[PDB]
């Protein structure tokens, strides 16, 4: 059975599909960026313009402000002349000087504002030009990226062509494997993979226990090494302390020297014992990580064999039932032979549910094909899956054989009230499950193959048209 060659080439052309999809993404977003840049340069330009306008507004206010004060000086002189035909003469002379010096003020303020307008106008000139440039820039960047994208999508359509053909061949392979080797053939292969699953699972369980205990051993040897090294450290202390004190002081002389010898002896003794315990901790750590490496390696083989077992379970079921896609009788016509004959399909738990669900999610994106799907995967319509076809596919992974009809799937398992549904349950719609089926995924979302034109997708649970009960198979 050369499934695995096409399965591999399929999956590698799907790897190429996603290369090109991210590449297209990079270009598409490139345009999005310089679109952002353009709209912000435009906002900069319009803001520099409203700054220039603000400048002319106060410059004109300064104009007519100065002219209002000039005309008050004017009416002051007019009053003076008419009043030329004593305390008040003094204070009105002082008022006129106040007005003249105020006008001096407003004068130099207006010159400053004239320079402010010169610069606000130049700033708007500049950043308007900046926006003209960046505008044409991104129109041209769009031209380039639209053309390059059109290239990418030509490549993408040929890749998906290849992909549809390869999937179509994989369906051929699954059929030849299970439709060909009759029941007892897949039965033997299945019993083999189920046995290898239980054994490699037990083996991995043993490598995990020993890795845990070797890790405990690494810990004990490491701590003992550290203790012995600390006693070596205290020897260093007490030796330099003895050294300093004898440096700072006949028979008394021999007593000092003997204590120095005893100090050095204790030091090298605790030091050698520290070196020994630390090389021992190093061995214990090399063993603890050789054993952690084997625990990981054996756990990989454990779930590898667990998976190969689940698919061989799906294959037994597939070889157990007729093609639920054609009509031509796949049985003999003259009473002159004797075939295999297919089973009859018409009217812990947590780990089990997750295996089924992985199978349905693995088909996310597969196109709809009326009547498509079996225990081995998608099939040609009357390639893809239809709603009740997908559920049939998923539960065969845990050896649950379902009919390729919603109304009949509703008769299997246990009828739970819709309000207590949980992950793994079958949600049905239509009277007596005559219209549609989906798998509850938990957390108020479900996976389904819904209607013509929709790929296998995850959608929120729908309450309109729901049957009165859900069905729980595991």
Describe this structure in words.
By secondary structure, the chain is mainly α. The chain has 3 domains: 3-180, Helix Hairpins, CATH 1.10.287; 183-320, Helix Hairpins; 349-472, endopeptidase domain like (from Nostoc punctiforme) (endopeptidase fold (from Nostoc punctiforme)). It is 71% helix and 5% strand. It is built from 7 helices and 6 strands. It has helices at 3-82, 87-180, 183-248, 251-320, 349-362, 387-396, 406-409, and strands at 414-416, 425-429, 436-442, 445-448, 457-460, 470-472. A 6-stranded antiparallel beta sheet has the order 1-6-2-3-4-5, covered by helices on one side. Helix 2 (87-180) packs across helix 4, helix 3 runs antiparallel to helix 4 and helix 5 (349-362) packs across helix 6.
Helix and strand layout, with pairings?
Layout: H1 3-82, H2 87-180, H3 183-248, H4 251-320, H5 349-362, H6 387-396, H7 406-409, E1 414-416, E2 425-429, E3 436-442, E4 445-448, E5 457-460, E6 470-472
Antiparallel strand pairs: 1-6, 2-3, 2-6, 3-4, 4-5
Offer a quick outline of the entry.
The PDB classes it as cell cycle. The chain is mainly alpha-helical. Helix content is 71%, strand content 5%.
In helices, the fraction of residues equals over 70%
Could you say which overall geometry the principal axes of the C-alpha atoms support?
Answer: flat
Q: What is the alpha-carbon Rg in Å? A: 44 Å
Number of strands: 6
Spatial separation of the terminal alpha carbons: 31 Å
Q: Domain count, please report it.
A: 3
Structural class: mainly alpha
The SSE string, one letter per element, is HHHHHHHEEEEEE
GO molecular function, one term: cysteine-type peptidase activity
Coiled coil: 10-79, 89-123
Family: Belongs to the peptidase C40 family.
Protein name: Cell wall-associated hydrolases (Invasion-associated proteins)
């Amino acid at each position: 059975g050369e499934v695995a060659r096409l399965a591999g080439s399929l999956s590698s052309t799907d790897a190429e599909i996603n290369r090109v999809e991210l590449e297209m993404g990079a270009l598409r977003e490139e345009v999005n960026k310089s679109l952002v840049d353009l709209h912000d340069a435009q906002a900069i330009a319009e803001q520099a313009r409203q700054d220039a306008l603000a400048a002319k507004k106060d410059l004109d206010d300064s104009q007519a402000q100065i002219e209002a004060a000039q005309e008050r000086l004017d009416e002051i002189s007019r009053a003076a002349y008419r009043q030329n035909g004593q305390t008040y003469l003094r204070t009105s002379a002082e008022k006129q000087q106040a007005a003249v010096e105020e006008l001096d003020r407003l004068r130099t303020e207006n010159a400053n504002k004239e320079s402010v307008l010169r610069q606000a106008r130049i700033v708007a000139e500049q950043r308007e030009a900046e926006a003209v440039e960046k505008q044409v820039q991104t129109e041209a960047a769009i031209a380039a990226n639209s053309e390059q994208l059109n290239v990418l999508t030509n490549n993408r359509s040929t890749l998906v062509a290849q992909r549809d053909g390869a999937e179509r061949n994989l369906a051929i392979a699954r059929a030849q494997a299970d439709n060909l080797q009759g029941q007892r053939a897949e039965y033997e292969e299945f019993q083999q993979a189920e046995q290898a699953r239980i054994q490699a699972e037990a083996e991995a369980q043993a490598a995990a226990e020993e890795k845990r205990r070797a890790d405990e051993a690494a810990a004990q040897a490491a701590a003992e090494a550290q203790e012995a090294a600390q006693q070596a450290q205290a020897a260093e202390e007490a030796q330099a302390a003895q050294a300093a004190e004898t440096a700072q002081a006949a028979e008394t002389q021999a007593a000092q020297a003997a204590q120095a010898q005893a100090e050095a002896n204790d030091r090298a003794a605790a030091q050698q014992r520290a070196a020994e315990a630390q090389a021992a901790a190093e061995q214990a750590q090399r063993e603890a990580d050789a054993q952690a490496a084997n625990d990981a390696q054996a756990q990989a083989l454990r779930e590898q064999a667990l998976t190969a077992a689940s698919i061989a379970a799906a294959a037994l079921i597939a070889a157990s039932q007729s093609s639920h896609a054609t009509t031509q009788n796949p049985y003999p016509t003259d009473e002159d032979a004797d075939p295999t004959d297919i089973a009859d399909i018409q009217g812990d738990r947590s780990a089990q549910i997750e295996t089924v669900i992985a199978r349905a999610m693995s088909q996310l994106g597969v196109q709809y094909a009326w009547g498509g799907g079996n225990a081995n995967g998608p099939t040609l319509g009357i390639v893809g899956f239809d709603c009740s076809g997908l559920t049939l596919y998923a539960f065969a992974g845990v050896g649950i054989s379902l009919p390729h009809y919603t109304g009949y799937q509703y008769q299997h398992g246990t009828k739970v009230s819709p309000s207590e549904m949980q992950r793994g349950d079958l949600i049905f719609y239509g009277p007596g499950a005559s219209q549609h089926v989906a798998i509850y995924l938990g957390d108020g979302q479900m996976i389904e193959a819904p209607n013509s034109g929709s790929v296998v997708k995850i959608s929120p649970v729908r309450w309109s048209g729901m049957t009165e009960s859900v069905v729980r198979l595991i």
